[PDB]
Every structure is written in C-alpha cells, then in structure tokens.
C-alpha cells in the first residue's frame, strides 16, 4: 500500500537502463533506503515483466547479509518503484575505478561474501546470471551484497565480459554460471580488467567460448589456480562454492 508521497527522494544512486536509482527516506519512520523507479513503458516494451517479477520474487524472500535486501514495492500509472536496501558505499564497481585493482585481502573478502551469498542463492536453485561490479553493492561495514536480481532464474534455463560460454552461447546453464562470473570477478579485482574484455562484443565472444586468457606476473599462483578453476569452459569441472571457500588461497587471505 505504499505510494511515491510517502517519501522524500534525494541523491541519484545510479543511472539504469529502464530507471534510476535514488536515495530516499521514508517520511514517517526517516529510515533511509534507495528508491529503483522502472519506467513500465521501457519494461513492457522490453517484456521483462518476469525478469521484474523475479527480482521482486527472489530478492523478497532472499534474506542474507551478503545479499540486498528489497524491503517491498509500488507502481503508479507509469513507473514500477523498488523499495531497496541502501548500500553507503556504492558499488564495487566505483571502488575498482577508484583502487584501479585490489590486493588480494580484499579481493579474497568480497569473493568469500560472493560465495557465501551465492551458496545461500543456489541452495534455493536460484543462480544470479548477472554477477558482475556494477551489481555487487557494499554496506557500511563495507560488506559486499549481492543486488539487480532482475537475470535471477530458477533451476536450468536457457556486455559479455562476466557470462559463461553456455550463456553467451545460448545453451542450457545452471548454478556453474555464477561460479564462472565470480572467477571473471577474482580475475577482474586483482588485474583491473575482466579477463575476456576485448574491443567488441565479437572478440570477447571469441575469448569466452575459446577461454582465452592470460595472467599479468603480479597475479601469485594461488590466485591462478583458483580463477583457472572457476574459469573452465565445463560447467562441470568448474568447482562449487565450497571448494571455493576451502581453496587455501581464499582461507589464507580473506577476512572471513
């Protein structure tokens, strides 16, 4: 029963392809929150009706630290508002523009949230799909959380720097997609680049499918056999969340 007046909207968040993220705060209570305001002329012209119902779904009743929250939700006669979880301090996007990379401590750290989240996500069969710095937001104790569950899918289904090669490829994926993104994110925290980006959507295409790429020397070799690991063109081979969390590079540098 919300309604946009019950609001005050302030800071832009975030710019997004159907919307805009803004912070706001909730004019009874003062409890400060980000505000997605989806245009439903976008989204229907986009039919990710499904896509938007499956956030509101999933990220609803996905309860987790490492995960953000989305508190509820309203529409009036034109936008679709999202009622989510503020994270203070922004993406781990912005954060990688600012650091340029990370050191493995803190690499390590938020792929250990990254895990811990997604174990939560895949013992409900719910696999991200769309694991990516933009989407990884971090809350004020700088914990990482997972948001824009608008990918989510349940169980197997069916730019392009963090997809699997079945995805991008168009065959069926399951809980292996995000195991493979979060191997492009190890990979992208500590080299700054993800390791498939090209100039063109044509040539990162070809290194996905052909997993074709290389480490710079300052990438140690426990950090390689991980990411080499995640990073198999196999779904199969490629580890799970807990060969992850128990890879000894991870327990001798993360936080958690």
């Known amino acids: 029963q919300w309604a946009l007046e019950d609001f005050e909207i302030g800071r832009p968040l975030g710019k997004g392809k159907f919307g805009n993220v803004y912070l706001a705060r909730?004019?009874?209570?003062?409890?400060?929150?980000?505000?997605?305001?989806?245009?439903?002329?976008?989204?229907?012209?986009?039919?990710?009706?499904?896509?938007?119902?499956?956030?509101?779904?999933?990220?609803?009743?996905?309860?987790?630290?490492?995960?953000?929250?989305?508190?509820?939700?309203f529409h009036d006669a034109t936008r679709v508002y999202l009622i989510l979880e503020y994270a203070?301090?922004?993406?781990?996007?912005?954060?990688?523009?600012?650091?340029?990379?990370?050191?493995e401590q803190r690499t390590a750290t938020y792929i250990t949230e990254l895990a811990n989240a997604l174990s939560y996500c895949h013992s409900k069969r719910?696999?991200?799909?769309?694991?990516?710095?933009?989407?990884?937001?971090?809350?004020?104790?700088?914990?990482?959380?997972?948001?824009?569950?608008?990918?989510?899918?349940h169980a197997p289904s069916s730019t392009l720097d963090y997809l699997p090669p079945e995805m991008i490829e168009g065959r069926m994926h399951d809980e292996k997609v995000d195991l493979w993104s979060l191997g492009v994110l190890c990979y992208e925290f500590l080299v700054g680049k993800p390791p498939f980006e090209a100039n063109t959507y044509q040539e990162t295409?070809?290194?996905?499918?052909?997993?074709?790429?290389?480490?710079?020397?300052?990438?140690?070799?426990?950090?390689?056999?991980?990411?080499?690991?995640?990073?198999?063109?196999?779904?199969?081979?490629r580890p799970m969340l807990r060969e992850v969390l128990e890879h000894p590079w991870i327990t001798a540098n993360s936080s958690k």
Do not use: C, M
Not at 140 to 149: P, Q, T, V, Y
Not at 213 to 231: H, Q
């Open 26 to 73: 909730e004019k009874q209570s003062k409890f400060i929150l980000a505000l997605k305001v989806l245009f439903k002329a976008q989204l229907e012209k986009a039919g990710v009706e499904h896509q938007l119902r499956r956030e509101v779904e999933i990220q609803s009743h996905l309860r987790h630290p490492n995960i953000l929250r989305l508190y509820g939700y």
């Open 88 to 103: 203070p301090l922004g993406t781990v996007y912005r954060e990688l523009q600012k650091l340029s990379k990370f050191d």
């Open 126 to 153: 719910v696999i991200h799909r769309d694991i990516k710095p933009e989407n990884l937001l971090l809350g004020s104790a700088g914990e990482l959380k997972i948001a824009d569950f608008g990918w989510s899918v």
């Open 205 to 237: 295409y070809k290194r996905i499918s052909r997993v074709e790429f290389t480490f710079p020397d300052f990438v140690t070799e426990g950090a390689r056999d991980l990411i080499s690991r995640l990073l198999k063109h196999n779904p199969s081979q």
